[PDB]
Amino acid sequence: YELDYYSKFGHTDNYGNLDLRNKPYTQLPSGFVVKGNLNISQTPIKKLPKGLDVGGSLEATNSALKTIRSGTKIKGYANLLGSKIESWPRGIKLGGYLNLTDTPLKTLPAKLRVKGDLSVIRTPISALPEGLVVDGNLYIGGSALQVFPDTMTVKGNIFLGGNKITKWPSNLTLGGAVAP
């Protein structure tokens, strides 16, 4: 079903951490604001409402999360390990890492910036967008990637995870190393 004004009141602690673990909710109110962390793991939610503002971290592991609307703000990280998301929207305010391990993700917006590690492990993504800048480590193990973008910035160590890299970026400033 949906989340009402009083439905969410039963899933909030003293610090405004909303816990929806395995709750049979399919959507959240439009323009939703959560003071603390949001947990929607293992939920049938297919799309996040537009204007969602999270003061903490996002956790949607093993959930049905497939669509995210632009303009969403996350102060912490977005943990989506094992979700059903297919495409990442542009303009998401994210202050942590994007964990997309075990996801059907295919495309990423151009000039994407991740303030932490990016994990696209076991994803059918074909090509990292040009201008992609990562301030942490890069995980591409088990993915369909075989060609890197011409320019990318990975402040951490790039981990290949087994896939063969045929083309390397021309302009790459790496603070670490490259591991298979």
Binding site: Y5, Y6, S7, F9
Partner: protein, 148 residues
């Protein structure tokens, strides 16, 4: 069932709980902002007098939506409002419900009924507590079986 009605600055009719009062049009009842005499009729009709108008210019502008459904088909929700058990069920406006103006309806809690229920719950709860201690006592005896 809270008839502590009030009119905000915009003119919308609400109650003490801050709930918009519906009308015949199934929309929140909005009254003209500069009114001078508001009277609620016996049948729920709202008659008002405009600011500075003569007493013979009273007019009816709305009618409070009064519903009389089957009581057994209603449940109290999380916010104290009774709603239909079956969802997506329209609320038909009954024409038999009448309102007695100038009075407030309080609760119907029978305090003595609560008190006698309280003392019975204490006794049943304290005989079940004795049962828990009795089960614990019986288990310690069985521990002596394996002492050899």
């Amino acid at each position: 069932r809270n008839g502590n009605l009030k009119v905000d600055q915009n003119g919308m009719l609400t109650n003490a709980s801050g709930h918009l009062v519906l009308g015949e049009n199934d929309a929140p009842i909005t009254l003209p902002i500069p009114l001078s005499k508001i009277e609620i009729g016996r049948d729920g009709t709202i008659s008002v007098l405009p600011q500075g108008a003569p007493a013979e210019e009273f007019q009816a502008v709305d009618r409070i939506k009064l519903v009389k459904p089957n009581d057994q088909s209603l449940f109290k929700d999380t916010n104290g409002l009774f709603r239909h058990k079956t969802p997506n069920q329209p609320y038909e406006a009954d024409a038999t419900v009448s309102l007695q103006t100038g009075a407030i309806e309080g609760s119907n809690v029978n305090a003595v009924g609560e008190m006698t229920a309280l003392i019975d719950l204490q006794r049943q709860f304290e005989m079940q507590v004795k049962m828990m201690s009795t089960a614990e006592e019986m288990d310690k005896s069985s521990d002596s079986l394996l002492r050899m």
